[PDB]
Structure 1
Amino acid sequence: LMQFTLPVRLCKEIELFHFDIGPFENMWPGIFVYMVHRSCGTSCFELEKLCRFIMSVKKNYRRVPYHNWKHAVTVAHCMYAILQNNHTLFTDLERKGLLIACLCHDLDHRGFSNSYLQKFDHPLAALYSTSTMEQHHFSQTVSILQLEGHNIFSTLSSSEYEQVLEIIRKAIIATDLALYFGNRKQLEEMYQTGSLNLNNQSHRDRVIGLMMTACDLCSVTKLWPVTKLTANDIYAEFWAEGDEMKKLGIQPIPMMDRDKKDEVPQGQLGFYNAVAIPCYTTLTQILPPTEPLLKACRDNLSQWEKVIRGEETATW
């Protein structure tokens, strides 16, 4: 049988949460196939159909500084590290579904938030009033699955197929950060009152939603030099959206204003405190083997504090 392999440094480092997939774009499909085979087995997909699916997904990602193909594969790797560190918790269907959801979660992203679509009066905002881009990303995912030769789920019953596309739909909708706050608040209550039950489908959903936020934000869990350079890509998108807000005659929030770069360090502190730390804290309480994400997140907050106090500087 045909079992994908990696050079020794990659074969080992890929098991770690802080793995960087590197600058060689033509290696990323091989990295993804490798992760699926070790996460779900050589059986769970027809390799011809998989590679065809991957290459069409790649084609429907755009040339944007942050929400691109590299990000898709990076987010899938985080989900792979979480699945491999908790191999006993997830069904055969959830493992298959979640690596696909991660690869597809940002399909056809143009570097703009839901707010900008609503202020621009984009057509997708008429089709879907909430989680605008995220419902688009999912309907893109369904389209690629319905292309001739791309149905990587072709061997499932009508029943399992519907279950796997409901896992993918909810997984992709949960990457809407507006939904994250309430989702994590409810999980924190259910954990502390001891009512959280992984056998309750409704509880599993919320838990899978937190994992998707954790994987989506995973650039804050890398080593500082990777985190620091990804920050330049994130703000490159943010500043372009701020410029497009000014063209509609709207003053953008300061974090989207390229005239307020000075405020980024303090902005990153807010983000680590209000979003990142709480996210990996709750994920670690529910899934203890995910502690390294929280630890790497705390290390980077401590690096942004160093930047504020002038003992360290980011050029951007």
Structure 2
Amino acid sequence: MQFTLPVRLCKEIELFHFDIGPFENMWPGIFVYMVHRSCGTSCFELEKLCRFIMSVKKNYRRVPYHNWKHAVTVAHCMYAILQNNHTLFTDLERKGLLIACLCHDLDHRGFSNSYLQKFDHPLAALYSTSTMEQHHFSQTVSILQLEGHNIFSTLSSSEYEQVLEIIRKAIIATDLALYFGNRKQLEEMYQTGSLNLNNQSHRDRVIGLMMTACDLCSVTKLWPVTKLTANDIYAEFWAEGDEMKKLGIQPIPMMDRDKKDEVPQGQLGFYNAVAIPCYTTLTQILPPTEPLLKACRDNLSQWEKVIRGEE
């Protein structure tokens, strides 16, 4: 019992810039298709996988950007990295990473770690750093322990502990505050030539950068997809900005809808300070991911065109 996709999706799903489409009822099948080719038809009991996916879906909320569509989109980018780097990854890693990507923003509310801390949200007392990401990992373990939801139950005890450790580090790594130092370290290790993928602490860092790259992959799509998704991410930013103003705090300009006019220039900074560096170091470490760097640079050039009034 293979999942099969229509011809256009069967071909395009293999490309980094694939968009999973507006038909929500096809996303679970798209995810299972990706597991079956990335991992095998044996990796998970279908009965259990199908029941884990629908529970994960139910625990994503109807926010403009940090939604179920984002979860599946970030898993597809991971699928494309793993398929283009066949022999670099263990079987456990292939299992753990697609599930980590699907779960990485579980129960997100559309608000940053900073807003939780200024609101004095209970989650900010339970987890002093990576507040939302520790919550996402907590929600992932909860769903795994629902009767009939243990997709890993047929792993050995220690293989089980290793896969939950991969998922945990992978989801904490999607805290962008940690990405800056993670990428500097990987930069120095690759340039001085000390990078060693048989060193666990090095693999961990490489997997963390892959998680940042999949997470940000909305900047790697065709320009029409990237530009329409930018509206979703700004609708969350500006809602958070409005909530900052209700706590009596001027938000950062990213979050102030009154400074919308300056979005193009704020996207440039973001591509230059975060996205380009991310995909460059990733392309240095895993050369076949170069199409993500090339699509990101194409989108930087479309924002330069917006600023020159040519759109």
After TM superposition, the score normalised by the length of structure 1 is 0.98
Structure 1 position 36, deviation (Å): 0.2
Q: Equivalents in 1 of 2:230, 2:277: separation in Å? A: 20
Tell me how many residue pairs correspond in the alignment.
Answer: 311
The 5 A counterparts of 1:1-316 are 2-312=1-311
Q: Equivalents in 2 of 1:30, 1:124: separation in Å? A: 33
Structure 1 position 70, deviation (Å): 0.2
Structure 1 position 28, deviation (Å): 0.1
**CA deviation map 1:205-235 (0-9, x unaligned):** 0000000000000000000000000000000
**CA deviation map 1:223-266 (0-9, x unaligned):** 00000000000000000000000000000001100000011000
Q: Equivalents in 1 of 2:189, 2:181: separation in Å? A: 12
**CA deviation map 1:58-80 (0-9, x unaligned):** 00000000000000000000000
Q: Equivalents in 1 of 2:19, 2:116: separation in Å? A: 32
Q: Equivalents in 2 of 1:172, 1:307: separation in Å? A: 34
Structure 1 position 282, deviation (Å): 0.1
Q: Which runs of 5+ in 2 are unaligned?
A: none
Q: Equivalents in 1 of 2:254, 2:127: separation in Å? A: 26
Structure 1 position 165, deviation (Å): 0.2
Structure 1 position 289, deviation (Å): 0.3
Structure 1 position 140, deviation (Å): 0.1
**CA deviation map 1:65-111 (0-9, x unaligned):** 00000000000000000000000000000000000000000000000
Structure 1 position 295, deviation (Å): 0.1
Q: Equivalents in 1 of 2:297, 2:246: separation in Å? A: 38
Q: Equivalents in 2 of 1:152, 1:166: separation in Å? A: 15
Q: Equivalents in 2 of 1:197, 1:180: separation in Å? A: 19
Structure 1 position 27, deviation (Å): 0.1
Q: Equivalents in 1 of 2:2, 2:118: separation in Å? A: 49
Q: Which runs of 5+ in 1 are unaligned?
A: none
Q: Equivalents in 2 of 1:87, 1:248: separation in Å? A: 49
Q: Equivalents in 1 of 2:250, 2:142: separation in Å? A: 37
Q: Equivalents in 2 of 1:19, 1:157: separation in Å? A: 35
SS at match of 1:35: helix
Q: Equivalents in 1 of 2:39, 2:191: separation in Å? A: 32
Identity within the alignment, %: 100
Q: Equivalents in 2 of 1:79, 1:168: separation in Å? A: 13
SS at match of 2:88: coil
Q: Displaced runs of 4+ in structure 1, greater than 2 A?
A: none
Q: Equivalents in 2 of 1:240, 1:153: separation in Å? A: 38
Q: Equivalents in 2 of 1:253, 1:12: separation in Å? A: 42
SS at match of 1:88: helix
Q: Equivalents in 2 of 1:182, 1:307: separation in Å? A: 31
Q: Equivalents in 1 of 2:253, 2:40: separation in Å? A: 47
Structure 1 position 43, deviation (Å): 0.5
Structure 1 position 157, deviation (Å): 1.0
Structure 1 position 194, deviation (Å): 0.2
Q: Equivalents in 2 of 1:162, 1:245: separation in Å? A: 40
**CA deviation map 1:26-79 (0-9, x unaligned):** 000000000000000001100000000000000000000000000000000000
SS at match of 1:269: helix
Q: Equivalents in 2 of 1:264, 1:288: separation in Å? A: 32
Q: Equivalents in 2 of 1:268, 1:43: separation in Å? A: 43
Q: Equivalents in 2 of 1:157, 1:289: separation in Å? A: 33
Q: Equivalents in 2 of 1:213, 1:107: separation in Å? A: 16
Give the root-mean-square deviation of aligned CA atoms: 0.3
Structure 1 position 199, deviation (Å): 0.3
SS at match of 1:311: coil
Structure 1 position 158, deviation (Å): 1.0
Q: Equivalents in 2 of 1:135, 1:44: separation in Å? A: 26
**CA deviation map 1:250-301 (0-9, x unaligned):** 0000110000001100000000000000000000000000000000000000
SS at match of 1:210: helix
**CA deviation map 1:131-190 (0-9, x unaligned):** 000000000000000000000000011100000000000000000000000000000000
